[PDB]
């Protein structure tokens, strides 16, 4: 019911910052939770944090606290992930993920029904 | 922080056979808020099971979720070729959500 499109592949050097955009189309944007989930190559999924755009209610995984910022823009239905102090270990595909609904303006289910296409961010020197 | 240990690491089965996948959580999952996801190479993962046993519209009948607290099972009754992917479990029972390391379901032979 909802399409998410992410910004494109990006190449970074250690010690720098990256911001990845996720633009949402369809349904309504403000009151459904959106999370960022990354995946290092060959390895498994890792939940980093998320936001509720209404009131920008954030929630961050502890291991990224201090390096991470999540923001949401209500007029463009676009959410943003900012990760700084990057190291090669941060090389991965980054995904935006939004709540599902029951029965598009239906009850949220918490679990992630809708994914963006992913954004490979490579950190290297 | 809750750890979700998935078992077995690598299921090796034939088309039409049955797949039973395990997810072990290091503490009780709050309100049985556990989901299962399918991921094919290069693709974004896809929601199969939510709230432990519920099934989103459009998801196939052959998929079934079950369990409570610390043990959960994802079953596939009749493996179709389009099911040989990687499968992840997830808990969202507390603010700090975690994923399992995943189970590779690969075609044997």
């Amino acid at each position: 019911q909802v399409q998410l499109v992410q910004s494109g592949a990006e190449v970074k050097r250690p010690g720098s910052s990256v911001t990845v955009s996720c633009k949402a189309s369809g349904g309504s944007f403000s009151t459904y939770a959106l999370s960022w989930v990354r995946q290092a190559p060959g390895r498994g999924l890792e939940w980093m944090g998320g936001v509720i755009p209404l009131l920008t209610i954030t929630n961050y995984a502890p291991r990224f606290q201090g390096r991470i910022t999540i923001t949401a823009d209500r007029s463009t239905s676009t959410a943003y992930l900012e990760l700084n102090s990057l190291r090669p270990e941060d090389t991965a595909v980054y995904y935006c993920a939004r709540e599902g609904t029951t029965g598009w303006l239906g009850k949220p289910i918490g679990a992630f029904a809708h994914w963006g296409q992913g954004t490979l961010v490579t950190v290297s020197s | 922080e809750i750890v979700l240990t998935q078992s077995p690491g690598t299921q090796s089965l034939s088309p039409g056979e049955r797949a039973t996948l395990s997810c072990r959580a290091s503490q009780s999952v709050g309100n049985n808020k556990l989901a299962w996801y399918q991921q094919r190479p290069g693709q974004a993962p896809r929601l199969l099971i939510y709230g432990a046993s519920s099934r989103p519209s459009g998801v196939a009948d052959r998929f079934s979720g079950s369990g409570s607290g610390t043990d959960f099972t994802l079953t596939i009754s009749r493996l179709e070729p389009e099911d040989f992917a990687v499968y992840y479990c997830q808990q969202y029972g507390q603010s700090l959500s975690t994923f399992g390391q995943g189970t590779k379901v690969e075609v044997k032979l």
């Binding site: 009151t31 209610i57 009850k107 | 808020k33 507390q94």
Partner: peptide
């Protein structure tokens, strides 16, 4: 205690009023 993943549930129940 409180679970961030429940917050939108409340936002929904609210709307069903407003």
């Amino acid at each position: 205690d409180p679970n961030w993943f429940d917050i939108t549930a409340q936002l929904w129940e609210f709307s069903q009023e407003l």
